[PDB]
Amino acid sequence: AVEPFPRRPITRPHASIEVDTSGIGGSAGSSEKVFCLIGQAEGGEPNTVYELRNYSQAKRLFRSGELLDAIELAWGSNPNYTAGRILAMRIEDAEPPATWADKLDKFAHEGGYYIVPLSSKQSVHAEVASFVKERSDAGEPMRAIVGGGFNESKEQLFGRQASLSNPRVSLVANSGTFVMDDGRKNHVPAYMVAVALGGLASGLEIGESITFKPLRVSSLDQIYESIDLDELNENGIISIEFVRNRTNTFFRIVDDVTTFNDKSDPVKAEMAVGEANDFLVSELKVQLEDQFIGTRTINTSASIIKDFIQSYLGRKKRDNEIQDFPAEDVQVIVEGNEARISMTVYPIRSFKKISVSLVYKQQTLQA
Amino acid sequence: RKKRDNFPAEDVQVIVEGNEARISMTVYPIRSFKKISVSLVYKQQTLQA
Amino acid sequence: AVEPFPRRPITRPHASIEVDTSGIGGSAGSSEKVFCLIGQAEGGEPNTVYELRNYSQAKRLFRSGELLDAIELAWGSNPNYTAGRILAMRIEATWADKLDKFAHEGGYYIVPLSSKQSVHAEVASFVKERSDAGEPMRAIVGGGFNESKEQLFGRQASLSNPRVSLVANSGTFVMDDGRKNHVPAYMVAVALGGLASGLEIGESITFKPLRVSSLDQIYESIDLDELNENGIISIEFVRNRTNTFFRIVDDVTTFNDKSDPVKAEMAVGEANDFLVSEDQFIGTRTINTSASIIKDFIQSYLGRKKRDNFPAEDVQVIVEGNEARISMTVYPIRSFKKISVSLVYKQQTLQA
Amino acid sequence: DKSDPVKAEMAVGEANDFLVSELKVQLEDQFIGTRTINTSASIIKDFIQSYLGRKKRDNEIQDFPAEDVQVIVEGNEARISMTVYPIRSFKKISVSLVYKQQTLQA
Hints:
The structure is cut from a larger assembly and holds 4 copies of chain A.
Chain A: E1 2-5, E2 17-20, E3 35-39, E4 42-43, E5 50-52, H1 55-61, E6 62-63, H2 66-76, E7 86-90, H3 101-104, E8 114-117, H4 122-138, E9 143-147, H5 154-163, E10 169-172, E11 176-180, E12 184-187, H6 190-203, E13 214-215, E14 219-220, H7 226-234, E15 237-238, E16 240-243, E17 250-253, H8 266-269, H9 271-292, H10 301-318, E18 331-335, E19 338-345, E20 353-360
Helix pairs in contact in A: 2-6
C-alpha cells in the first residue's frame, strides 16, 4: 500500500509525506506439508482437531492408545528431516462410530495435506477417498495413504486396489514389527506402516519421492520375492523390499505408485509429481488472486504480471520444485475485464530408470 | 504524422451529412481485472552432459 | 484431457488454472513378444493360463511333465538373450475351447505340444481368428521323432497357412539335470519359438544357432534346399569347420510365395504386425486445381521440408469426388538372405 | 568357442561380472529416487568418472577414455554410455630377432 502522512488532509500551506512499503514487505515462503491422523485413543475431547508439536504434548493431550503410537511413528521414522506439525483427532461417538464422514469434515479447512485413517475397513478407505476428492475439487488438495490388516494375500490386495483405483489414494501392502521408545516390540497392521510412510513423505521436501528411501522396522511378516514385488508394483501397491545382497540388511520403500490403474500419465500415477502439481497450482491461484484482482488495468499491467510470474517461477526453480522454465513462454494478454496468462513449466521427476551401455574396446599399447 | 512526431485506420469512423462531417474515434478506458485465466503447459526437456 | 482447477466452475472474481499434461504422457511403446505354450503337465490346475517368470516358479506350479521340459528349452536355447515372460496352460479331442482362453492374454507366438495334425489345424484356425481381429498371433509346429520328406511335404500342404511354420528335424537336448533327453521335433519348435520371442521385433531366426546335442537326421545341401523351397524349416549341421555347430537354415513359412515377402518370411510378417505408421490446405484458397498441380504443390512443400530437415517419382496422386488421396512409397527394413560378390582380378605394373 | 574372451577366459569374465555388478549396485544406491535436478547429468558424469578412475587405479581395467563418458537425462530416466578397455593377461609373446653386421675400425 501507499499511505499519506498525516492521514487527515490539510488545506493551508504545508508539507505532506507519502510512503511506500512494497519494497520491504515480505512474501509467503514455500507452503508446508502437514500430516493428519484420525485414531482410536484415550484422552482429550473427541471430534476436535489438535495441533501437536511435541511427543510430550501429545502424551498429555492423549494417552495409551494407537493414535499416540501413530504420532510416535510419524515423528520417529524420519530422523534426518525436520519434524513437522501433526494434526490429530480422537474419534468416538459422544462407542464405535458407524461412519467417519461426519468427522473427517472437521479437517476440511485445516492446513493439512496427507490423511491416514487408523483403520483397516474398506468402507473407511472409501470415505477418506471421497473426502480427499471433495476437498481437492474445492481447491484444498489432499492425498490419502491406506493399508490393510495384519496379514493379507496378493488376492486380497488386488481386490482392495480394484475397490479403490484413484489418483489420490495409495495402498501399503506390508505389515511388520516396530520397536518403540517404551522399549516394546509390537506387531502392527499395515496401516501403521502407512503412518510411517506418511510421516516420511510429509517430512521430505516438496516433490521429493519416498521411493528407495529407507524404512526402519524390526521385521516384516511377509518378505516378498522379486517377482512378488514386481507384481505388486504393476498393480500400483506400495511394497517394502528386504535388501539382502548388501552386507548391511535394511528395508527399502520400493516405489511411490498410487493405486490409480493408468500409468500413462505420471501426474496421476506418482505421488511426488502430483503433489508438485497440486502445490504449484494452489500457490499460483492464491497469489495471483490476492495480487491482482480488483486492481486497475493500467496500461503497464501486461508488464507487471509477466514480471510477477517470472519472479514466482524463478523462486520455484531456486527451491528445486520445478526443473526449469522458458522465460519467453511467459506471455500475458490483457482485455478489458480479463488477464489471460500463458506459461510453460518443466516439472521435476525422480529417477526411476538408469540404463548403462558399456562398450568394451581395444587399445594398442606400445613402447 | 502527429503520432510519428509524438491512429489505427480500423478505429476511426467518418459520417458526412448536410455539409457537416462527424469524425468519431474509439477510445479505451481503464477497467479493473475481475478474471485471471492461466493456461499451464507441462513440457519436458532433454538434459545432457 | 486438459484439467480445470478448481474442478467446480466459479463466476465471482477468481483465478483458474488449466493444466495441459499431454506433453508428458508415455508408455506408448509396443508389447513385448510374450511366448505361449499348451501341453501336458502334472500339478497345475488344468485349462488355467498361468503367467510364468522363472523356472523355479514353473517347477513350483507345474511338475513332472513335458510342459516343464518345454519351459526349460524355451529359456535354454537363448541363454545370451533376455529370458522374458512365458504364458503356459496345463491341458488335461477338441482344443479350440481351450485355445479361446489365450484370446485376451497378450502373447504373440504359440506352440501346441502335440504332433497331431488335427491339433495343428485347430491352432492355425485359432491364429487366424485372432489375427483377423485386432490382436495378431503366429504359431510354430513340428512333426514326430522321424518323418520323411514326402510326409513333411504332405503335412505342409495340408497345413499351408501364412501364420504357421513347420520344423522338420528332431534331436537330443542336454537338460540342466544332465539328462540326455531325446525329444520329438515339436520341442525343437518350442526352442525356435523361444528364440524368436527373445529376438527383437523384426529380427530373424535364420542363421541363428541351436544349442542341441545331436539331430536324428542330417540333411545334405540338396535336401535343405528342397525343404526350404517347400516352406519347411530345417536345421543344418555345419561341418566346414573344426568348430562344428547347428544352424537354423531359414525362417520360412508353410505358405510359400515368391510374389509376397510378408507371407513367405516370418520376420517381415512380424515387422508388418508391429510396424508403426506416420497438414492440409483446402481448395477454397484457389479457383481450380488438378492432380498435376496438387502433385507439384506437395512436391514443393516436401522439398522445402526436406531442405529444412521427396522423390517426385515416388508420390502418386488421385483426385476423386472432391477428395484427393496422396500416396507415398515407403521402404521398410528387411534382412539379408543373399550376398552376391563379383571378384575381379586385375593386374598392375609396379615400377622402381 | 575361443572367439569371445569374456566367455573363453575366466579372468575376463570375472572382471566383467564384478564391473557390471558394482555399477548396478552403486548406481542403484546413489541415484534411484533422487530428484532430476537441472545439474543431475553432470553429477552422474562426475560419479562415473570417479568410479572408473578408481577401477583404473586398482588395475581392474586398463583405461577408460574419459571423453567417451556420456550421460543423457530425459524425463524419468538417465541413459549412460561409457567406453572401457578391459585388463587382459598376456598369453602370447612373439620375438622377431634380426641379425645385422657391424664394421669396426681403428
